[PDB]
Amino acid sequence: GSSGSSGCHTLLYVYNLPANKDGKSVSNRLRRLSDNCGGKVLSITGCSAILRFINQDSAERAQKRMENEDVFGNRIIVSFTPKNRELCETSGPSSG
Numbered sequence: 001g002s003s004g005s006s007g008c009h010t011l012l013y014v015y016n017l018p019a020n021k022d023g024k025s026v027s028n029r030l031r032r033l034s035d036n037c038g039g040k041v042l043s044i045t046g047c048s049a050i051l052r053f054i055n056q057d058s059a060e061r062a063q064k065r066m067e068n069e070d071v072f073g074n075r076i077i078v079s080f081t082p083k084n085r086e087l088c089e090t091s092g093p094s095s096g
């Protein structure tokens with residue numbers, strides 16, 4: 001199979017970013033918030049961003065911090081899954 005990847009690492013997905021605020025400025029602000037959460041801002045697209053963490057834990061401290069943090073006069077949202085589409089499908093149990 002091809003569709004779908006599998007890596008120990010843990011990437012994060014940020015949303016609700018201050019587009020107005022030149023990215024060159026936004027990133028940095030995040031970099032610091034990610035540097036402490038053992039993470040790395042791979043790239044920053046539109047009002048969203050993608051980070052790279054070693055393990056879930058590390059990705060959490062950031063997902064729970066940034067989510068509340070405010071890059072600039074704006075609250076950001078951090079999620080482990082993509083916010084491309086929404087569905088009320090009850091499936092996929094949480095194990096290990």
